[model samples]
Target: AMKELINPALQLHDWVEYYRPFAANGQSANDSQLGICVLEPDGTMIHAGDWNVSFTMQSISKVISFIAACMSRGIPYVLDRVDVEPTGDAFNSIIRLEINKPGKPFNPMINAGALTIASILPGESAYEKLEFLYSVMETLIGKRPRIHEEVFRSEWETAHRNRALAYYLKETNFLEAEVEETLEVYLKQCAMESTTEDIALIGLILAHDGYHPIRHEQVIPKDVAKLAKALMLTCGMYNASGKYAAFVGVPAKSGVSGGIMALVPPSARREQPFQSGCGIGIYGPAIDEYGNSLTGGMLLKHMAQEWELSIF
Candidate 1:
């Protein structure tokens, strides 16, 4: 039955071409670059366009860092620093900190929450903390992740808003490390470069609740994976999360650079190709108003509708 549907590669090509124009609305001309990959639990891989194109992890790194922090500091401790709720404001908005009393970040998916997460991520110094994060990434993707120096340098130089947020967190006692140190770790993590397949594999592990099917080992604890997935579903797409949940109905995390890491849990439907589960990775530098990939989001929505991939 799955084979009867349109070829995944062909569908991907068509969508990429059709939506390339949307990149004009994105933050950079590179937004025109498009790619998509679907990796099934059985190790089957299907991809099209620039699926191997390397891009900065951007906001998507929040999910991984949050998981690493939970693994090291425990979920309760991490949650105490950053709440799990979603904020409908822009991903970098800082108004809520003052408005919300003690100024705990609303959730780890945003810059504020992610900054706090970076401060508590296992190590005492910025280098040590980032090394710990890289080790986790190496475990997930089978290679030591590299930071895109250009992106890192640019973000570091123009990170006034982030620095402001970090200072505010410092004032509230939410930041555990020095503000500059935490910002380095956070920005470097964001600059980590990756391909769609890399994020796809991570998504696959999360789909199985942290069990790496390829490795046949539990890489992340079940509870931690559940918490991460819940955060992705509720806050991963930034302010557009609710719209995505209503329309796509999957656990997904997107970045400003036009990458989305999404996963589907095991399904009871027997005829589906990924009945056991699958991870989806997509990129299109063009982004919507909410910072989600414009073409990528459209493609995933089409897949959800046509393949019944939505959990809801």
Candidate 2:
């Protein structure tokens, strides 16, 4: 049931190149960079395009912090501060904060919720909070994660909308730390850097319900993994999560930096190449209006169809 897919190397390379033209449609100049990687449960890896190019985690970091918080503080406690519901509004939109009284963030995938999660991370200071997060990342990727200082500085200087959101959360008592301190942790997490392979490994652990197949260890709790995946399926793609759920049909999280982390759960369909499941990582700095990878997403959709990867 876990036999290698035939000629996946060529197939993946061809598809990546086929979508290269679409990178021109990206929302930013950096969006022209594109990469894709797929890691099967048996440790087989297939990759193409600029798969080695590094990019910031951006909104994808929300998944990590949410998981870490759940592991440290417990899921119910985190959920008390942030709901699991999805908002159709933009990721950074503050309208919902006011409209939804008591003002808990709708989900950890959005800015407000992520800020609140960052504030409550199991640590006394921002540095300690980030250190804990890095440790979790290290367990997943097998090394220390580095912050992209330039990206962090840029985000720090221009994060007006995020600051506004943080302040609102602070006012509502949703934020556990000082607004500035929480913002530092949140923005720093967004700036953590990685390549397609790194995120692919993280996704693979997620596909296995928190188990790391390569390391043969349960890196995350089963309940925590399930909750994170549920959030990814429902709220991870920002405003376009529903559409992606209908089409691509996998658990995924995307960042404004044009990276997407997606995974296929172990399937009952034995004939499928990765019936035991696989993790997919994509980067195409060019993003669509919804802050997802443009060509990268198209490539993912193509793979989901061609490989019958959707859990549904």
Candidate 3:
């Protein structure tokens, strides 16, 4: 049944037939794992494969954090701090931040912008701000996600690039908070824990265009949700945003930890998962040059094809 909708023009047959096996094999080799799940427009999952594994949000976190900022600070305020322009460069490319001067970050999906905004989150301290963020997610997904302390510890110690980005932001006056404080918020947020189930639920909410389908109520402001989806579509895949947006057409964010959080918007088709709204979660550890998981991306492209899921 799943294979019927995919047409040859989508070029997704190559993925289901060839790439998926490679993705699975690569995961086994790396001692990593992969999972994929879909939520329906009615907030029910139409399908789930490997729905139970735990994974980190990694850079994928930028999506929600950006949303929080918009909600906390208003769209104009947040965009004032961070521009919406797309940078063809890598996520950690700091030279442009210096060259760009006082521009904060062109977008939150990248390291420089993420670290900068993470610092100014609404809280007296890092912990307080982060707790507020967790609380927001809990409201939407019905569970509070904890920070993965081990990952936080590991990243805090080795986040030289992040530190550099923060310092640059500080020097340029784009960063409003202290450097250590900013890094603390950034790393801690990245460590915020989740599972495929969590992201899948989230994708569903976004698919509903920011409402909870089951509850039939607004979980987040509609305008805020739209802003987040726009950001994800343009900047969610780091340097590969153009390719991913052109092909997949879903708003998704990826992390270095091999997690992908995707939210499908309401589509014209009535048959797809959470057609009015749905969220997707995927985990695959091996990352590609653009910092997205190669196999994970292939899997989504394949699933989108068979499911008639592309936004385009």
Candidate 4:
């Protein structure tokens, strides 16, 4: 089924050129690749494309960091700092800080909220916080995720706006540590290198609401997983969340690096594939204006319809 449906879905090339107009400055239209991994309920893995190609997590790191914060500090504590409401603004938009009251972040999926969450992550120093964050991922993906130094340095050097956001949070007492320390922790995590298989495993665990059925271990709490899914559905794609929710109808998250982490819930129809639910990880470096994978997003939409992967 996957061979027939996914292969054809991948062959559709219209979006690749259609998306070129929206690519970042100096980015090439030719910078496109698609990889996908789908992990089934019974530990079976199905995948195709450049699934082994490594890419930085970019904004997708926000999801795991949010989960990490919740795990260490409890939901209420995390909620006290950041709300789960969708802002509908661009992920990096800062005008909302002046628009919204008390300056609480709209959600953890965006830069403001993610930076806030990174500040409060369990640790006294930036290095400790990153190490702690990595340890959490190590348990989930069965290896310590590596930070691409080049990527980290590039982001670190050009993160003036992010620095402004951090200091803003600092002024409001939203940041727990110094601005430099928090930025280091946040950017390093964004630079964490991962492939489709690694993210798919995380997706699988999330699809099962934190239980790693393959390993027979509870990696995250049920309540935490539910909250993360809810946030992903409502705010994961930045301003594109509504369209994706209406069309794709899955709890999913996308990053600027053109990575998407999506999952379906167990279905009532036994005739459907992945009736017990599955995790999907996709990578396509070419992105749209909304900072989502162009080809990869199209692929997921096609699969969601063909496979009935909707949660709604």
Candidate 5:
């Protein structure tokens, strides 16, 4: 029945054709390919497009790092370092740190805040910090994740702005780790490679409030999952988070790599699709001004609308 409804909806197109050309800058504009995965609480799943296509996690890794920080350092400690407030500025914008006082980042979703979280990742060295993150990823994803060396190298050389953000964080004394070490951990995490299925599984765990239904294990605390969802709903779409909330109405996080990890909560309305909750993952290399997947975002909104996946 779920597939029945989605079959016709999936046929709807022109999304790629219309938004494809807008991938005008940043990285590459390869808009020709896309992938999607939908996984239900029962472990049932659906796949489409280039489901095996892999790409770096980009900013989407921030969500995992944020959760990892909470798991290792406790929520209070992590929150003390970075506030959860949403800002209308770009994801990489560093202006807010200076304007906002003692220079705590507004939230873990943006680069400034993410850098702070990266700097504070529990570890003795850059390799150790990444190991901590990969440990969490293995627990949630069932397999160890790997770094895309090419993407890591590309971003490492061109990350002057990110370096500037790290330096700003250093000046404010907000960073717990050395500047270069923190940057290494953060960028290496961003360079972690994945396919839609990997993130769909991760999203499914998040949708279930950190409980892995397939494994019957609590991978993340309930409160921590709730907080992560709130942050995703409020700040996950970069500066356009508000618009996304108003329109899509689901808790989601995206990456400049054109990956989106979105999930719907269990709704009271039983007639709704995936009323018991589900996770969705999408990949499209083409991005918009807000650093979101231009075509992938459209596909998600369409699914959300047809299935009433929004919380509101």
Candidate 6:
């Protein structure tokens, strides 16, 4: 039923052609700033446009950071602090602590919960934890990626909202460490550099529900992998997650940097790119107020329709 509805949509997905040239800009005036890939069931990655261009993962980095924290620190340990619920608030909302009075963050995808998780990520020092997380990217990307210190500084200097969220979480005892310490980890993680293919590696592993397709190993436990996917499905695109999940029906996450990491789950459908589930990496460098890449989402919408690859 899912395929039947989607294939027809594919037949008509050229509807996006009216906007294809426009997919590069989204809301940002920047074009030539996007990359895309679709993995087939047999593990063949079919890519188009800007495949070699590199961009920071930005908030999209939160997806792996959450998984790493769970893997190294244990789910119970991580969940003991952060709750998994959708927030109608902005990614960096601050009205909750005063209203809920001893409040818990809505979910790990947002700034508040991510900061808490950053504080507790495995290591006695922030450098150790960041290094440990960086190793995970190295393993996935096959390179030692560098952090964009300029972006980090830009964020650190103007992270007043994050500071507010941290203090609120800290007041409620949700913070596991000092405010600056956790922000250092969170900000640095967001500033870490990556390319579309680099995230495709992560998305591909996640596409198999945590199995490393290349290494042919189950790097993350299935339940944990599913949990991560569920979070992405329900909350990964910031406030727009529900809308994307309803339409695209795939597990995906996006960032304010105009980057997106999307995955199609394995299926028996007859499609070209995603005969099997695959990871997708995209960059647009333009974003909406919700912190999602408008062009990136439009592109995924087009792909999902053309390939008839809706997880729903």
Candidate 4 residue-wise lDDT, 123-200, digit = tens: 989988998899999988898998899989999999998888788878777777889999999999999999987888
Evaluated against the true structure, the overall lDDT of model 1 is 0.88
Q: After superposition, how far is residue 117 of candidate 2 from its true place, in Å?
A: 0.6
lDDT of 3 by residue, 1-312 (tens): 221110321333344345545554443214235566666654445333444667778787777777787788788877777887779999889878867755568888888878766866788777787887787778877878777889899899999988988988888887768888888988887887777767777777776677877668888888888877888888888889898877777788888877788876666333633346467787777677777877788788766666666677
lDDT of 6 by residue, 178-250 (tens): 8888889999999988776678778888878778887777877777788888898888987788889888877
Residue lDDT tens for model 5, 221-289: 999999999999999998888988888888889999889999887882136467788888888887888
Ranking by TM-score: 2, 1, 5, 4, 6, 3
Candidate 3 global TM-score: 0.88
- Residue 133 lDDT in candidate 4: 95
Model 1 over residues 72-141: C-alpha lDDT tens digits? 9999899889999998899999999999998899999999999999999988799999999999888888
Stretch of 10 with least lDDT, candidate 4: 1-10
lDDT of each: 0.88, 0.88, 0.73, 0.82, 0.84, 0.76
Q: How many residue pairs clash in each candidate?
A: 2, 2, 12, 0, 0, 1
Clashing pairs in 6: 41-276
Candidate numbers, best lDDT first, in rank order: 2, 1, 5, 4, 6, 3
CA shift of 30, model 1, Å: 2.0
Q: Which is the better candidate, 1 or 4, if ranked by TM-score?
A: 1
TM-score per candidate, chains pooled: 0.95, 0.96, 0.88, 0.91, 0.93, 0.89
Q: Please name the candidate that would achieve the greatest TM-score relative to the true structure.
A: 2
State the TM-score for model 4. Answer: 0.91
